[PDB]
Amino acid sequence: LDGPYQPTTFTPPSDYWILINSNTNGVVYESTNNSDFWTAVIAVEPHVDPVDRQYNVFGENKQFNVRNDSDKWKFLEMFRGSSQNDFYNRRTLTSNTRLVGILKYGGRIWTFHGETPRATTDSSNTANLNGISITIHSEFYIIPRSQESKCNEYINNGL
Known part of the structure; x- marks a missing residue:
C-alpha cells in the first residue's frame, strides 16, 4: 500500500489497483x-430520494x-462506449467504507461492484487500454495486482 496521493490526472500502468478514498459526494x-471507453463514478450519500443531480464529467x-x-454509500459507474451514446449506470458499488477501486490489466478494466462487505470485481473491455487516463478527485x-486480496479487504472493510 503506497500513498496517499493527492487528487490528480494521470495514466497508471497496467497491473496496479488505484484505491480512491472518496470523501466528497459528486464525481469520484x-x-x-x-474512443471506446468512458466511465465516471458518482458518489451518493445515504438515504437519498429520487432526485436529479448535475455532474460535470x-x-x-x-x-x-x-x-x-x-445506510451505505452508493458509487455509480456511469458508462458510455462512444462519445455520442448516453451515459448509463452500468455498475453500482454500495459501501460503507467509501473506497472505490480501478485496475487496468489483461487488456480490460476491472472495478469493484456489489455491496460491501461482499463486493467483487468485474471487467470491462476496450480496444485501447493503454490510452485510458484517469482524473481522480480524492x-x-x-x-x-499481486496484493489484490488486500485491495479486496480494504474495499469491503476499510483501511
Whole structure:
C-alpha cells in the first residue's frame, strides 16, 4: 500500500489497483481513452430520494437521476462506449467504507461492484487500454495486482 496521493490526472500502468478514498459526494473519478471507453463514478450519500443531480464529467454538464436508499454509500459507474451514446449506470458499488477501486490489466478494466462487505470485481473491455487516463478527485492509494486480496479487504472493510 503506497500513498496517499493527492487528487490528480494521470495514466497508471497496467497491473496496479488505484484505491480512491472518496470523501466528497459528486464525481469520484473520470476515466477515458476518448474512443471506446468512458466511465465516471458518482458518489451518493445515504438515504437519498429520487432526485436529479448535475455532474460535470469529461467537461460536460450532465444530469442523472439518482437515489441511494441504503445506510451505505452508493458509487455509480456511469458508462458510455462512444462519445455520442448516453451515459448509463452500468455498475453500482454500495459501501460503507467509501473506497472505490480501478485496475487496468489483461487488456480490460476491472472495478469493484456489489455491496460491501461482499463486493467483487468485474471487467470491462476496450480496444485501447493503454490510452485510458484517469482524473481522480480524492486521496488515493496504489496496490500491485499481486496484493489484490488486500485491495479486496480494504474495499469491503476499510483501511
